[PDB]
Structure 1
């Protein structure tokens, strides 16, 4: 199963991968490139690499949690199981270190050159810290000593603490994979940021708890320390840890001290350090929280902000209360508490998508109308692209009689009434259009039109209409025919239209 291994090493065709590299052909090229170095090089966005990093993360986390505690509260640090654990952990880290040379880096296109690009760049960047972390230094030191004890013991713990420098690597890994996870699952940034901070914060607290206890151990439990004053040196490890952790935590969240304020200088300085660390962390957390909160209601906030401008405008012109109310109502009907700019979004989209959206919007209208179903779909598409959405309140004159008409209408939803001299009352339903005659006749509006209820209309401008009809002269005839009947019903004969019909 070498082929399988090879496949694993190369980048898979994931959704994220596709997004990164565009087409699938492009992905293949990357794979081919990878193939140059055999049974050695690993691509940064590979599946195997992901798995490896996952493996690392758990282990790393454990080490960060467990190691300090082990160093501090357990004096028997040369016992079997512990030793076994340590060596094994070190091995994994060593392996990881080795892998980083095989692993490709990303800066432009990813650096796939094995001996030159990856090795020489990594050796001058992060290799120094990593190497120290990977190797078991304390054990080496012990071996050296082998080939007066208290001092040695004291020294060893500090040396062992070098194994905690793996945190940097962990951080790096998190930063890498989190970016990848944004391009997969569409994560909210703020949430992610807060979670990381929380993880960091807790870790720091833990370290402080360990650290505070540790200094006394290192300093041989002097009587003016906090451990000796409470008389909990001979108490169980767990209790001590808890107390230490509590002490650390208080400083972090700005509560208080331990049993008493620190007496000895060493203790005092440690406390101060913790406070400095803690307070800053807390501040950062607060900031993060604020950011998160702002993000969460950003959609709602924005709308309100936009509306505020409208209010200000009104104030500037000193409009009557009634008028203001009307405007407010209109706004409510139009946007329904949702900020967006159709002009921008539609522009951003491509043609087919736009068509799809438009069709969905006006599907009902299309179904209703007799002209739209029979004619070619291309014509329909042409028509619906040029439409512009409008909302009218009840008691608004949509068209006034005698004016110069720039735009016709299409009733998607609601009921509008027609008013003409000696025409009684005529009411229009959904899937009806009005204002077609003034654009055809090139004259004035034959009669007034006023909305009965709230009317949701799709307007079409004159120029657009003309453009549409230059492409499809057969559809104009139908329109003309429709107009003529309406005119007859009304009682106002348009002569030009009649002439045109005769000609036809």
Structure 2
């Protein structure tokens, strides 16, 4: 049993524990660091301190709802049932104060030095504002005065010293909400707004007890609101309902309960309640505004970027024909989602980038035969050096005769090769153009027009040269496929022809090599016919 107590008092492996400590070795280190001292110390992340936090929070909200109401409307406050509840909550919060001695804080590292450091820090921090609210001063002062209507007044007053149990509630709810509200966007916001409206109802309830308490301590003078409305004799449900209604009407600023307040005490209490209500309502409106702006962030940022590009198009005074094509492109590329890609892919590390890239191009590695038959290290490097692009229908991707600087891998949407003295050649998903320009270091062979809405993957020339100089068997493959494709087109490149005639006669090719090559070129005939 005591081993279970020690394992409870030591910090346990949890999500917050891992977020604090990093590796589990730090959790074992903290477990031994707690296991230094004997039978006493509890850690501020332990499940014992968490459950004691929760039990004391339930008891606190219970007592702060039932304390003030009990004081005002119950002029017989010496009943056995009432005294039993009072001493129960008293010994419960004395337990919580001694555990507040035997806890430990976190400045830096978590301080676990009991007899000097945490004792001095706690005795300098909150011991007065807890020791007033702990012990029942209402029975001590009563047995002192026993060892009298003014004394009955004074023992009705000092019970409100237990309202200083409030500071423990906010001091605990700080830790509790920061632990159990870091989950999502909706849940944290909704628990924060319900936190605030719970605070507002607590203040309305306290004020509703106050507006009857002060006409009670003066024994109901004949001009205050209670003896004007003639409800000194009405049963306590009616008095509490009216006092709470009066405080809620002051709080939301609707109006005075009665026509007006005439006595001086009622007048000043009404004014103080009005100030507190206006301030709390202003804070509530501010929190509602902050919650709304936190919910509406993404659409706002997208409209910011849209207004920026609209201002750019306005500054150059482009025609509306072009603005329609630009907004069509932004829709067809970003799909109404604002995000920066290079920054995120720079923030992630190498295997996360490799796994994300392999998932985004899982279709292309299957559909191209080259990627299906090549080595996975080459495939991974060539895949890592790619770039997304979106082409609108009917614009030239590659024009003939210009200098070549990249190649493109088709992912979605058919694009056509338009060679003169050739009809047309369509290219489905899973194919590539831009081979022979980069392999021959010359001018583009035949132009390419984007028929449908193409979604292409492009690869620059320097990365292509680095990868294909690392592994040259794929360069032999590209040379052979480019030879067949050029022979079908009609033009021929003697540089690549002589390089292959010196390459194939050198004997570096194998039986499996040219069998794979024959498979690839018949596959290329298939994905140029289709």
Q: TM-score normalised by the shorter chain: which range applies? A: over 0.9
CA distance, structure 1, for counterparts of residue 417 and residue 197 of structure 2: 65
1:307–1:188 CA distance, 2 compared to 1 (3 A): farther
Asked if the contact 1:394/1:455 (under 8 Å) is kept, the reply is: yes
Asked if the contact 2:200/2:280 (under 8 Å) is kept, the reply is: yes
Q: CA deviation at 1:186?
A: 7.2
CA distance, structure 2, for counterparts of residue 274 and residue 496 of structure 1: 93
Asked if the contact 1:190/1:291 (under 8 Å) is kept, the reply is: no
1:415–1:342 CA distance, 2 compared to 1 (3 A): same
Identify which range, 79-88 or 196-205, moves more after superposition. 196-205
CA distance, structure 2, for counterparts of residue 163 and residue 128 of structure 1: 13
Structure 2 regions of 5+ residues with no counterpart? 503-530
Q: CA deviation at 1:185?
A: 6.5
CA distance, structure 1, for counterparts of residue 323 and residue 210 of structure 2: 65
Asked if the contact 2:182/2:188 (under 8 Å) is kept, the reply is: no
Q: CA deviation at 1:339?
A: 0.5
Q: TM-score scaled to structure 1, two decimals?
A: 0.98
Identify which range, 379-388 or 249-258, moves more after superposition. 249-258
CA distance, structure 1, for counterparts of residue 426 and residue 404 of structure 2: 20
The residue aligned with 1:412 is 411
The residue aligned with 1:492 is 491
SS at 1:184's partner residue? coil
Encode CA deviations 1:445-476: one digit per residue, 9 max, x unaligned: 11111111111111111111112212211111
CA distance, structure 1, for counterparts of residue 55 and residue 474 of structure 2: 67
SS at 1:51's partner residue? helix
Q: CA deviation at 1:194?
A: 2.1
CA distance, structure 1, for counterparts of residue 163 and residue 394 of structure 2: 75
Encode CA deviations 1:42-85: one digit per residue, 9 max, x unaligned: 10000011000100001000011000000011111111101000
Encode CA deviations 1:98-120: one digit per residue, 9 max, x unaligned: 00121110111111111122111
Asked if the contact 1:190/1:288 (under 8 Å) is kept, the reply is: no
CA distance, structure 1, for counterparts of residue 224 and residue 207 of structure 2: 16
CA distance, structure 2, for counterparts of residue 42 and residue 81 of structure 1: 35
SS at 1:460's partner residue? strand
- How well do the aligned residues superpose, as a CA RMSD in angstroms? 1.3
SS at 2:125's partner residue? coil
CA distance, structure 2, for counterparts of residue 327 and residue 183 of structure 1: 40
CA distance, structure 2, for counterparts of residue 216 and residue 272 of structure 1: 16
Q: CA deviation at 1:402?
A: 1.1
Q: CA deviation at 1:433?
A: 1.1
The residue aligned with 2:443 is 444
Identify which range, 330-339 or 402-411, moves more after superposition. 402-411
CA distance, structure 1, for counterparts of residue 403 and residue 239 of structure 2: 89
Structure 1 regions of 5+ residues with no counterpart? none
Q: TM-score scaled to structure 2, two decimals?
A: 0.93
Pair 1:217 & 2:220 matched: no
Asked if the contact 1:418/1:426 (under 8 Å) is kept, the reply is: yes
Identify which range, 26-35 or 471-480, moves more after superposition. 471-480
Identify which range, 124-133 or 188-197, moves more after superposition. 188-197
Asked if the contact 1:15/1:184 (under 8 Å) is kept, the reply is: no
